[PDB]
Symmetry: C2
Subunit: 67 residues, 2 copies
Amino acid sequence: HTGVWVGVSGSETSEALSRDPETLVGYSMVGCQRAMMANRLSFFFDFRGPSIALDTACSSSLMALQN
Amino acid sequence: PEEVVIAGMSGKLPESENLQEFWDNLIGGVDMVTDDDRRWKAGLYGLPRRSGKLKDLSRFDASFFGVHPKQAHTMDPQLRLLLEVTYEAIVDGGINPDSLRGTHTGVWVGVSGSETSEALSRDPETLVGYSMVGCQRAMMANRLSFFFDFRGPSIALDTACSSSLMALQNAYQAIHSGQCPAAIVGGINVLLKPNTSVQFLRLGMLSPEGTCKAFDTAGNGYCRSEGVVAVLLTKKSLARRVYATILNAGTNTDGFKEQGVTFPSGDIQEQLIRSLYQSAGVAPESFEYIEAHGTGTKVGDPQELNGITRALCATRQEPLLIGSTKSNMGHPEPASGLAALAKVLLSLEHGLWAPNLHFHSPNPEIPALLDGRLQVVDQPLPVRGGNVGINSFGFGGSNVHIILRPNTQPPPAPAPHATLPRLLRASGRTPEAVQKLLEQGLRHSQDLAFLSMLNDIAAVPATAMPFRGYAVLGGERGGPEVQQVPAGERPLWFICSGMGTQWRGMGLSLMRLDRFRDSILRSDEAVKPFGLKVSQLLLSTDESTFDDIVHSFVSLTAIQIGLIDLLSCMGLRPDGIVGHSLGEVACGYADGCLSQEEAVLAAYWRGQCIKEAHLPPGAMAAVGLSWEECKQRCPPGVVPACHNSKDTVTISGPQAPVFEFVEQLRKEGVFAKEVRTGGMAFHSYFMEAIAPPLLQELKKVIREPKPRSARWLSTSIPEAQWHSSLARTSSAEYNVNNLVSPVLFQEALWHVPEHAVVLEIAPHALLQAVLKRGLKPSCTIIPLMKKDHRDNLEFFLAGIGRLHLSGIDANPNALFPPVEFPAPRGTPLISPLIKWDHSLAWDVPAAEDFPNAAIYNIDTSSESPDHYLVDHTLDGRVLFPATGYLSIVWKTLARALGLGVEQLPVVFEDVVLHQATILPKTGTVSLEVRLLEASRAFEVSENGNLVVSGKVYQWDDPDPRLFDHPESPTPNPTEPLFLAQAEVYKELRLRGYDYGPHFQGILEASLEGDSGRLLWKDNWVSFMDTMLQMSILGSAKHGLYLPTRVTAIHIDPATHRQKLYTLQDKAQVADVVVSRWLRVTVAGGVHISGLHTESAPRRQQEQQV
């Protein structure tokens, strides 16, 4: 039932990879959206617990640890 | 732990400014997903034509929420709407936000996009620093916590498509474990950047038809929809209204799956549901309606529905209702959970289930639908009873699920206190808000829970909300009254009136109020020994009953103590107290220096000693003569009894001298009236004879004196001697002297601050006129009771309302019995009632801002502004005019220099056309223009192929001499005949030019082709093409000739305006001249030199056979 809590506060890569509308590949949103920062880990490691990505404004890591 | 409940709710879902509109759309079946161009021009990038969208993002009550205007512009629309929605939600459950301040309430907000962060951070040089404070995704929760002063956790989850329900689950765990006593869960999603929709389309999730045809055979995708919902979850102890109770909530992740990261798993969902309903202790048969995710995906729907079938439909008999809210409003990606919760709670509130749109052929892969074990809500079905479920499955693999037990508290049985009138008070930003609240309250004059909730949330300081208003419900009369409340804290004063104010059955109406009845009953107990029952006296209807002094005094005291108690219940502590003669004792109680029994006994014994004396008859009258003038005018035996006012005075004495003086004064014309003393001398030497027995009795009555406070100003001891022993304590001696001593009432008034609020605590406001006259004009007065009124309870409530309008906060709910909680189901929602101040427009990001060298798309659709180009047909196919190239390059240059077209005289040089662009009948063609300011050269390209090249630059010094019409090649044609429009375009048709009405702009032409008059329909393309038509008209070369090179062109709009003229009709015309010797064509304000045309092939396919 292991869970994942990831403290993240930026997705600049998502902004970069969505620059062009004609030539943007769909699977970018699988691999750059903020939510996937935890869902990808849950997917590879086969964890059935919670999966969360929280900003919390510069205390994301220690917040995730508290959760 | 403790039960957790969904206290409040609020939001702005698609096509709904408040949840009331949301329910009205849902039950009415109206599809909430539109096809307008609000967010971006429809049909772009192949994106779905239809999507759900809010109504207006450009409104925000900036001043109230303490955001300075500059930072208001640069704040994400999500947060601007979310502050309002959260405030509305908190007050929905009838909880004043100030109460939560200082508590550990949290704010869990589910946001998946920060599109506005990019929008305000795309220009490094001129980007303002405020953006981070109001746009960074973390500030979504921090801003709420900062305004409402919440000390609990402040997070912002990011799981996609499930952030809202995950936030709700986290809040449930927080409150359930006792960490937090309240929580504000919310979700926000606004569609601004089309690139995100393009991404989703590339992934394959979006349905081209733009309809989330949930559970149907033809399920394709989901239509993006935007909403902002918030919910307030608090423990069962603090709740006012309980929409539902959260029995349990949990979540789990899909983990590895063979199909892929984006393939939902049914086994995990079944496990989650079973684990929740087993752990919580809820029987599987209990569930009634489950709000399946219903994304409409061909894959997700069968998986989720089969999971629900295994988890709940295994061993139950009655069918289980299954519905999906996304079939109405679309799919709010990160706010999906809260939208479904709002739908479920509204359905529970109103007693019906909202039907599901777009369900005609049930899907075959879900057997339960065909076997009837699951039933879709195709029509509005009445809610039957039982638990409810909700589940959102974000595509990242995060699953959540919540069990809800509806609130079913029945309306209370009618009670006598329901018949009695109630008071209502509402506050808001603008008068429309107060009127809305009062009107809605008046529409429910019987829902006591609704009225109490409204009264609770009305306590807000004037600065926050500058308009208040009160309305008495159920009274014989009296409408709403809303007036602005001037700023500043204002003082409150009590003034207790004296003798004469008693009347028949006074106060009989107030006895229906419980607190007043308790006060009067305590008084009746207090005065038992002497055979007088205050309640019995009040009820007694004999007119002579109040002839005796004893009854009058006791009754006045009892009524005043009752009124002081009634005010005391509301929490009002007076700052100043100034009484008048008898009833100063009432003031004594008001301060606290006297006990109710002590005061009533003092009053009774004063009265009784009055009788025992048997003093000679004596009448006191009001004399218009002032206090200084009257005294020296007073005859022997008469003196100034009470210095009521400068204009009004009272003097007493033997009845005969009083009558003689009154008649003499009436001869002099001054005011005079005898007060109802009943024949007992008041505040004169007559009372001197009573002091010894009265002093004895009073010493008996009050045994443990108390010290008078600085609030109450002794209107019996002159201001000079306020440091005496008597003035310190209102002992028996103080009251004795007060009885004997004159009434220096007016003098004591001055110390009333400015703007202060005066209350006349007494049965009959006899002194209200006196206070008005002798008080600062800035003050405010209130009677609280009027003689011989229909229902004094109504008047008292009206007075409390007027007090509310005057600044102080006196909540009236406490007057009647407290209403049992939680609020019964059916109480109309309070969230829609709140109205904000939306008189300013705040900025929102535009499509242009988001990233995706002038590009001009030419569309010939009838709605397109370039439809006029459909009339430029040469040899049977539409071609883009050369003048069109000139015009687009001109506009691009104008944009480069910053000026407008009509103020930019331009010069073209060495213009060359390479290939002719054919506008297709359908679709569009894109044209690209690039300028090289340094080299004064431009270039037009299409699909990467050069179409036109040349030099364009601004004209520094225009010369009107240039447009003077050149000498005609034939000085004297001397031919009255001339070609008209029909003949001109007949000739051009014969050559091969097929021009439509728009491009037909040659009203006349000379036979030789040298001069003519051109129309001006306010379109440069048509005008210059008409000039080229004139040039081609005189050519002796049969065949289709098209321009290929123009050496130089000069355009000066000012000369163009000065050259035009109007005919007998309203049409404008500009003369045109062609000179083949100089090779110039001058018309209006256009000069064309060095044209060159090359014979077109003139070959067209599919010629008529």
